[PDB]
Structure 1
């Protein structure tokens, strides 16, 4: 919303104005990947001990 002044004389009368605006959000995405070492998976999961 806006404030007004009270102009005098040879001019149009200032009238109150209000301004509504609509602005839209944005979607993005990030990523990372730790590929785990093959035999070490078997070494941690059991059945190589």
Structure 2
């Protein structure tokens, strides 16, 4: 003669990640920091680029 059974199961999380890159050239930093700006319309176009 049999008896009803119960089961108890436990699972756990597995962790992962995602990464992506993003580059900036030196001239871009120089134009952004305004360290070597001359205040003329020629470099405004470069900054906007």
- 3-state DSSP of counterpart to 2:31: helix
1:37 CA drift (Å): 1.2
Matched residue, 2:33: 45
TM-score (norm 1): 0.62
Uncovered stretches (5+) of structure 1, i.e. residues with no partner = 1-11
Larger Rg, first or second structure (1 or 2): 1
Runs of 4+ in 1 over 4 A off after TM superposition: none
TM-score (norm 2): 0.62
